[PDB]
Amino acid sequence: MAMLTKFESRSSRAKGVAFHPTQPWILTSLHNGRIQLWDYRMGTLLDRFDGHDGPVRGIAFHPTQPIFVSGGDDYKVNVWNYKSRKLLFSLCGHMDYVRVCTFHHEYPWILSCSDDQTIRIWNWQSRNCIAILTGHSHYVMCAAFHPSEDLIVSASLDQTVRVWDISGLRMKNAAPVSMSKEDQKAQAADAIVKFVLEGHDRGVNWCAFHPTLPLILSAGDDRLVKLWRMTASKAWEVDTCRGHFNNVSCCLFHPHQELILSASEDKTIRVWDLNRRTAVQTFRRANDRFWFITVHPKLNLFAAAHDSGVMVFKLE
């Protein structure tokens, strides 16, 4: 397989990247605390955003609203409007580095996870934290909403991947209620762990759902990428991709081909077969560790963050 590079930015270490759903943009979140907005069709720098102190690992666009969210080592989950170019507010509550932040595709929610061993769900309209998911016993390195089901998957340095049922939280946060102002409490099961996936012998750095199949991918400091399957009642390990020679920082499913992608501190991006879990192709940079990979929500277009910036590319 061949990599067709479409855009590269050279910079100090990049940690996160996010594709805009409809515009030819990527947000890049940097170790230096800044966030860049690039047009990858023209190679132009559209804006730069400075609202964090220290590295910013979390970064995502809302799918339809003119918003993006960022999460930093300063513990804040920041919500911005990219049209007015301004920081709207900070969501505070995490007590250690924020590792990932994303928006839900339908509900007015933001998902964040943190080294404080928690996953938080926020309602970005009310600006409240509506759930704190506890149960991991070390840093939560990744969390993700399922694309069609009321599930979250999370990965932790406790060596586990957890699947959480948030159907209760959805029912409760959506239910309309009338409120008598004078009759409120004077300072008065939503998310339940469904599966705990055990198998990695070291910390887990990343987890991903497949967009249409009941599969989970996870990757970690054991240099392995694992494939898991789930039903309504069970979840189990299917197989392992073996080949990386250093920590695997990120992994994802190719949304339109039977392929798995992973990215590693071994300075490679690897492609594997979804059915055989054998190697298909290895792409290497000489001096740059990879920290993150993502795929466009519709196009076969990928982006990777590494020690010297970001790249946007197609595959053969």
Q: What is the CATH number of the domain that holds 290?
A: 2.130.10.10
Do 13 and 30 contact (CB within 8 A), yes or no?
A: yes
Give resolution, Å, one decimal.
Answer: 1.7
Cβ-based neighbours of 284, under 8 Å, separated by 6 or more: 267, 268
Cβ-based neighbours of 4, under 8 Å, separated by 6 or more: 313, 314, 315, 316
Residue 124 sits in which domain range? 1-316
CB atoms within 10 A of CB 8: 16
Cβ-based neighbours of 66, under 8 Å, separated by 6 or more: 81, 82, 83
Structure determined via: X-ray
Tally of domains in the chain: 1
CB atoms within 10 A of CB 241: 24
DSSP for 83-147 reads TTTEEEEEE---SS-EEEEEE-SSSSEEEEEETTS-EEEEETTTTEEEEEE---SS-EEEEEE-S
Q: State the burial class of residue 120 (Cβ atoms within 10 Å of its Cβ: 0-12, 13-18, 19+).
A: buried
Do 57 and 73 contact (CB within 8 A), yes or no?
A: yes
d(CA 190, CA 282): 42
How many residues appear in the chain? 316
d(CA 2, CA 174): 46
**Token pair for residue 291?**
């920290």
